[PDB]
Amino acid sequence: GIQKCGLKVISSIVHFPDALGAMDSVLHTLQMYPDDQEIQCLGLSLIGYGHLLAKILVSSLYRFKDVAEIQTKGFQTILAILKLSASFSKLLVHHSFDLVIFHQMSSNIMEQKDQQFLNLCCKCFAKVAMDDYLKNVMLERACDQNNSIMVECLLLLGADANQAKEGSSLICQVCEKESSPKLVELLLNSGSREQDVRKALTISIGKGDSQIISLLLRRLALDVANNSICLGGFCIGKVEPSWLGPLFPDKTSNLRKQTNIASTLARMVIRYQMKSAVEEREYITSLDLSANELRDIDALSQKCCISVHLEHLEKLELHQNALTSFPQQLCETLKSLTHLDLHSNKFTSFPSYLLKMSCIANLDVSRNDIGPSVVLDPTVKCPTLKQFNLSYNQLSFVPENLTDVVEKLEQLILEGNKISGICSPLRLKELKILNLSKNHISSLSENFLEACPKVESFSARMNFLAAMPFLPPSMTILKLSQNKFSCIPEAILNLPHLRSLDMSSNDIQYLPGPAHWKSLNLRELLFSHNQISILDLSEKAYLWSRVEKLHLSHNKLKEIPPEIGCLENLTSLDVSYNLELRSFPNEMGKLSKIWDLPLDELHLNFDFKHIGCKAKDIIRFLQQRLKKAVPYNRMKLMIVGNTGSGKTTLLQQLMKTKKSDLGMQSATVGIDVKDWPIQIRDKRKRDLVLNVWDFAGREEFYSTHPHFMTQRALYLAVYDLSKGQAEVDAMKPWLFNIKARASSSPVILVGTHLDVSKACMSKITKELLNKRGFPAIRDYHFVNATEESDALAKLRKTIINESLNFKIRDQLVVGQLIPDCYVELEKIILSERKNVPIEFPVIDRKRLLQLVRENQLQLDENELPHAVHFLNESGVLLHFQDPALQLSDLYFVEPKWLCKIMAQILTVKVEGCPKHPKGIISRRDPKNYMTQYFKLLEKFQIALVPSSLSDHRPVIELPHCENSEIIIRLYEMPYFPMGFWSRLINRLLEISPYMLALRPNRMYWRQGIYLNWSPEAYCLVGSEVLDNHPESFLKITVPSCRKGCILLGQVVDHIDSLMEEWFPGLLEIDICGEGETLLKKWALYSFNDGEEHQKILLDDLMKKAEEGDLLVNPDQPRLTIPISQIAPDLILADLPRNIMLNNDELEFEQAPEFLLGDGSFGSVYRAAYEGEEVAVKIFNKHTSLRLLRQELVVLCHLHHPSLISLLAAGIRPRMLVMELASKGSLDRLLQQDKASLTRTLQHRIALHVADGLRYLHSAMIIYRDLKPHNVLLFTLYPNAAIIAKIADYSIAQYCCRMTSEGTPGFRAPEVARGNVIYNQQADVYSFGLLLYDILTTGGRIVEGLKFPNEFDELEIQGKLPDPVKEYGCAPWPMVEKLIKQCLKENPQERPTSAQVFDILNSAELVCLTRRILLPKNVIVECMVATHHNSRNASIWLGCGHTDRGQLSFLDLNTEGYTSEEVADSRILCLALVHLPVEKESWIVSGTQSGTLLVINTEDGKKRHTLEKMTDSVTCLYCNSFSKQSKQKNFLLVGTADGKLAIFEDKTVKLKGAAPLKILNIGNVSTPLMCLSESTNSTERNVMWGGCGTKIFSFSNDFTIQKLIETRTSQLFSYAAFSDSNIITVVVDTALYIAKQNSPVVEVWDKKTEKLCGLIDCVHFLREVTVKENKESKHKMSYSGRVKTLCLQKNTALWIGTGGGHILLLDLSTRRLIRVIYNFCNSVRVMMTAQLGSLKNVMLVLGYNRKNTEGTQKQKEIQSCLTVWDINLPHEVQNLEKHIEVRKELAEKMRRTSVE
């Protein structure tokens, strides 16, 4: 017990002699003598002179929480420790330091004048929370224990609240700990992601809390600005009024301000941190309850707390719930419901008391299981109902008393039911859209529609119908598809207003000519799937001049009559799948409006589908065939041999080359193209000229031949018969190649030696050769091939007769008709062949385009791309339109040069040094031609020489070859086609980023690659033949691990996308005989894993059919192999493993259509997956498995939060799972829910679409079709995370199967003409059109649905009208500039997608409501609004451009500027006094001459001059001073001497009224320059005016009760900033001051009257204006001075700089929010107001001056009035949060692509 004296003497001695292992003992003595207060302090005060220090400090301070000021000693010790070793805070916070510091800063220190201690404590905490992680852990450790004050103080200091665990983060735990609602309200109102709030919602549903949910919902589902409750997607199993209670608004909500404790603490901590850092009604209507699986809603049918808000509901949604029997009490409580839709619920009978609501419409119960009869109560009258939707129930009879109940019904929908018997009269008076589709209706009673004289859209599909009951003469749209009709009945022929007729799928016989329709306004005639033989139109065609769509597909058509050219307005003709047309009439060329015209499954009189043929080229072609056509006489006679033959020695005698001057020719290089014409001296003068291509036979060029083997050809073939019956076998590779490349081309075998002998090989040529997989042999001769003889003349005659009768698809190719333009261009190319340099006969596009100008060819830029191609086919000039092959500008005339050049490197060998392995080479050679040489070889992939490359295969020893880890898939085919491997080993080669950029070391011989990354990732695409096999197998070995399969699925894809691209004859099922298919893609597997001695063959087709299961097994079913080990491509297991279907969880029923709700009779259904809702997209039989697999590989790696993300994909059936967009596409939204778009959701959709485009264009892929049908919303709650999402299946479907021009209306100008290839600047134009249709809310779409030709051609140039003048809409004029930017014709003048997103992100785009350009050179220093008229307001202005008085009226909705001189002296400021009697509001004129002039609002003549003051009046005000037990008001005229002229509200009418109580306040040289009023009305409107430099205040006394001075400041940094004239003052919890040229505001107070704050402007400007403003370095004499103040209610304070800037200061916690520059030049006057029920706007009267004539010392002023949305300070930070959240989501989604 002696330690006390010891420590006392140590404390005495540690001070005087400057003392120098004591600390260990003084630490231990605490634990040896604990709890003794007298020695605790003696120790701690000495510690200020191993974490045991912390371990004993925190525990001591905890055990001595509030004893006395030993806490002062301990905290002094801690601070002394930190200021030398700051990292000790990491250990303090580690042990317990929060448990003591929170109790300290919460031990009722407020109201305790112990501030000297709290200052120390906060100074310490400011350093404890230096590191960000320390803050984020102090927050976590402050949220467990319920401590609202400290958790808010920690939030005001940063310390984000979305970092704890991201699945069990702050709120996720806080909701479990039964926290206080005030604690959750602080986490929510600060930064907090949505996905965690949604999880916490469920947790707090688990418990019963009526204030933690009601605060979670208010941030999850409440669009307060739009009066909505978007509670849809939540799986809230129940609904309680105690939850929605505080959601509804109520006026009685008003509170005190007690959180200022947290503000004080946070500001003191921040101050110490900085000092340490620098030195050292409005009833809401929409109530959405869609996805909440409500099993009953009776909880609302009580007398609950919200039973008063329901009487103004006006919309209620309950669709997709599990309800039943809508409660009786409810449907009577809400007496203003006008949109009740509840479908997909499990109802059982239509209540029929639902109609007992007062004013209802759009009653929608349209997926329930309503019973057979729906008998309606004959005593309830509901004449308000419009749309009685009842689709997809189990009805057996039309509603019973429909007539006498709903008279004014408009669209009775009854589809999907089973209405069976012949219906009833149904005398409804106001129907407009009937609907009875998919019922079982045999026939209608012939008086059915006889009494509904307004029907317009009768739609009865899929019935069993044969007759029509006298349709009313007002019929417009009539859909009768899938009926069982035979003839268009007379009831449809006689409708004098018909406008559309959908009668597909009926076995019709007679489509009547236009002389039987009696309706001059046909627009659409859909007639697919019928049996229509004739297309009678010759009768009278011009009556149909308006038919815009004529679908005749799948009929028995024979020809299209030539009268079809009269229907000029025809837009989309369809005659596909007829298979018996065979010819198009040349009159179709006049249908200039056709934009799509399919050619599926029919053969015509021309070659189409080249790379274009987009239904627009066909119109030009058939129009040019209308000018003048000439038969085309030219074919290709390709020769083929092998390395020795009569090829160049037989050709010389076919063409009868008389000279043969070359005494001895040599082997051919290349192909040696020639021409030879045959003017047949006969009765027929057809001078056919066919160009032979005498291919080279030497075995080294073979990989370049398959380029020049086309289908329009009549191949020869030569044996060199000298080697009898041995070459016929040795020549079969050539015939096989001919069959592979050009299946439908003949052959003429020619044994080319009889001068030397064994011609019995005719037997073998007849037995093995004629009809076994080989092409259609058409003859076989035995020429001599050196001299003319009858045998060779018979060969010439055979060639003649075969060419003139080639006739593919019965077309007679050598005599088809073509436009004269092509023959003309051909003659010009032949004439120009003679005038080109031999060393470089290439021609550039410009020179040819000059040749056509020289001639009179009528070809335009849209004509040549077909012209040169059709002249390319005929072998006249070679052109390569492959865009990847960047040489499309070159036009190779005389191909016999290019073909010899491309083959000259393949013969130059080196007899030097073989330093490189055989086949690899470097660049060894002329002037700039050598570069293009191997820029063409590589373009042909012949570059590394894939020819002459190591024929011998090297023995490679793969690591794993144990019959169980290897996957093999043979490819048995008769022979390798000619240019197969050099094509194949060049497609697998250049794919380096496998396993996606790590390339493997490859060792490739001629016929194999073996690229290996490692023993687990390799691939050997070999080439060997089994024993006893005349074929050649392509073994592909791959390790069966998961990584390996990717390789397998990627190589089978390359070897299939090649075979159908180059050799379509192989994989062509020869139905004749048997489907040998010429390509047996075997698969190898063995049940006995390892040492099975064999792998059992199994055709891949026959195995594909065994996909009903997943296991393959022999006839002995005990052991089995999974399919995913023998063919991992058929099962989608090669692609990222996350996209396997997992059918055990996918709950989905294709068969029903009421689940097809996604899209009107589309193909995508709605289903459940992983217990969640998704949208599966069933494909039809068209999409082959390979093509679906090809689209999935590109779809699987987009993964953006603005793109429909893939979820699964499988077989049984071929489906595709994607995310479900709840609110459907956008076009339906803006077509039927136009009141939902709310000027901040219209912006969120645009932002999300711009983000989608900015991400697509990053991956170098353009969308090509962006229209309101491809934008799929997800929720209508604006401040959400994911709202819009562009459907991305289209881009994959295109990039795989290459509508390519886009929808007509939503299409760029560069895209409609099609002349040029597109760019990222076409999606931007389409996005601009999307923005114009969002702004006008789909006005252009609706109007263009009746003017499509003008819906397209008006916008095909950048000439679309003004969104405002045409369609009524809010101007929102910071996007009309964005539109006028994105709607330019020059593509690179349109902003790229990154900009159009980065200028959509600006939060002054969503808040600038309208900018109003004042007239040129109008100077106004005073404005005033009109608020007593809430219908429209006006802004009376003054005049500064004249020294004579003039007030300037200005309306707002009309922008009608009215000028009226009303005085003789410059006006300074105004005020608007309203008088509640006589219904007017007089306006005042304060003039510099001193006359107070007043004029009335309506009459501009009842003007009377008030009492004249002394000097220039400077400020006025209209008060709220009703202290006489009634309503009363004054006017406070403040002269430039202080003599405040007060008045009375009604005496102002008096000529020269009485200034009531005039007080001389200041001096004539101390000018009054402001006047204002308190913020609340509780203090009885205490007025606070500035005066010169003297600030005062008063009340109903009108006497100075405060005369505070501001010049006398003890915070002098500069004098004139404080010693200058005051400008404005605003009154709140503090006082804010503005002075002339004073760039700083001084925060004064009411009571203490002290400088509570000094807030500089450029201390915010010069922190953003650092790098973006470089010239400002010489601008040290900075401009920008406070010219005005205006305080938002309690959120922020707006400071207008003298420059063009405007500040947003959150007065409460954080100062700078944003700086909104570059919209004006001087914010001269700023005020708040209310405009047309959209109250709370912030007027800003800016300037705009241009130095056009600044040299004349004159400036061109443009006073730019704007109208900001006062909710801007919330918007800017909410958007800053919403963008960061989507960045964080795009990152998490980009991590999913990795794994």
Ligand SMILES: Nc1ncnc2c1ncn2[C@@H]1O[C@H](COP(=O)(O)OP(=O)(O)OP(=O)(O)O)[C@@H](O)[C@H]1O
């Ligand atoms: N993920 C989704 N969520 C919600 N709705 C969707 C989704 N995907 C598509 N839809 C809707 O389904 C409808 C059908 O879309 P689809 O892609 O089949 O159109 P389409 O390709 O033009 O049809 P078709 O191929 O028959 O011409 C569209 O109207 C679209 O709004």
Ligand SMILES: Nc1nc2c(ncn2[C@@H]2O[C@H](COP(=O)(O)OP(=O)(O)O)[C@@H](O)[C@H]2O)c(=O)[nH]1
């Ligand atoms: N003696 C003789 N020689 C022939 C006959 N037919 C072709 N040839 C020879 O075949 C050679 C033609 O070369 P060719 O094989 O066509 O060149 P390649 O096809 O491009 O490889 C000539 O040199 C002729 O000598 C023939 O009937 N009699």
